[PDB]
Write a protein that binds this ligand. Sequence first.
Ligand code: IUM
Ligand code: IUM
Ligand code: IUM
Ligand code: IUM
Ligand code: IUM
Lengths: 4, 517
Amino acid sequence: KKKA
Amino acid sequence: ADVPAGVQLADKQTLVRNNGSEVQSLDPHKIEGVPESNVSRDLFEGLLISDVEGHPSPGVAEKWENKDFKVWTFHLRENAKWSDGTPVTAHDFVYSWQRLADPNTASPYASYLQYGHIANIDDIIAGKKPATDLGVKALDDHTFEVTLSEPVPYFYKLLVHPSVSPVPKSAVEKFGDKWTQPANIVTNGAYKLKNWVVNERIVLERNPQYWDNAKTVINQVTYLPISSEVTDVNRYRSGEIDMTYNNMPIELFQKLKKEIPNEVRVDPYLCTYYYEINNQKAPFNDVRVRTALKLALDRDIIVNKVKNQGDLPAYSYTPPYTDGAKLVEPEWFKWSQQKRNEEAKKLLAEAGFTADKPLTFDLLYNTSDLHKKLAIAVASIWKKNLGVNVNLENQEWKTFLDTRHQGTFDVARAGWCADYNEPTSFLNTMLSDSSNNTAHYKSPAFDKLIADTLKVADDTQRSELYAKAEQQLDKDSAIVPVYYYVNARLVKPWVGGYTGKDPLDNIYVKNLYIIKH
Ligand code: IUM
Ligand code: IUM
Ligand code: IUM
Ligand code: IUM
Ligand code: IUM
């Protein structure tokens, strides 16, 4: 998942 | 939640969490980030969930079996229900996984069914066969059967991810894109959506139909969208936020460690921070240009003298502590910075980038104090060690994701966290056709290395193939690795149930509880  | 004997519980069981930014969506087939997944785990539950230490455990499926790692059968619990009282059945999963695979859904995680190798996924993704052809079947209302095209021993580890959670067909089909509004949404997790105010808050309340509802303690949880780490800290310490987002401000960190050391939680995290290069955009399509950026970046200054929050300088994409990773350290990582700079200057000069004609490009990051401070320090190191001109640009989260998928960027701040603890959770995102490939990296040599891992039935050759795949990415300089994260955040002393033991940080608010204070 892309981590903000 | 499993409350210890002797703990006194507060009278009001409510929790406020900061979530980093406004989510891209509440539909599980349309999300790709950590903010999106934090809220999704509390609303939608899939076959397995993670326990408080991170291990894959029973969710909707009570038990499951496999035949040769190729045919997996899940026995769904009879009391699993949606928030409207209707039962969660195997048919919900057939519908949901075909909707995820369907090109029309345009899910950023379409490829997650490829990672799992469900029969026929490649043809469905390519428009060659209808989604109804997917290798999943409901043998009855309580038995879901999945067929893979190859043996995948770690298959069930993937199932804790939001993309493979169920969606309620009746709401999706009646409201389209507004099926997620509070008045229309139907959920099967421990909470249901109460309120959603864009750029203000998301409020969830307990879902009484949840099968494990008798163990849920918190009745209400609010998710805030604050992307300023300094503001998240201020509001935490003034008493409004019980748990920060896990981005810590360079401005206050050392001081919090000194002042409220018991509240500062720092644990291992399987995520890598890096600068994503658009591999298809000139002049970034030249390996010398990418290698110079990778080498001229001084990780010791950035990690240890600028951020200084416990991260480890990185030399690869997959974190070296991932289960099954046996990576070899590249020799450039072993050199001095001085030698890296000289080599970098040399390669940039070979590409046609003089002092008379510096390379100039944009560095895009998602609005944030932390990413801005890091981008400023990096633009500065690249200027000093290479003579390149860097234009900093910030974008709100959901737009920033969009820009990267579209390819309208040069270089972008990035960070990938594992979805399951196995090296393909990282490596599959660099496949040429992966829907998560925002590097726009296309390498047939890399793709073949990953394909072969499932053709061997030996974990030593699989690991050896993962280490060669990291070496291929390194050779191509597909990205600029910066650091391997530590998960750092503040948690009030009265928030019980958070161990910090799961390296994937799969928190469920249903496992937490507020101690009387
Ligand atoms: O499933 U085994 O090495
Ligand atoms: O349970 U095993 O490789
Ligand atoms: O814990 U194991 O492969
Ligand atoms: O430097 U420009 O897109
Ligand atoms: O808080 U300030 O860049």
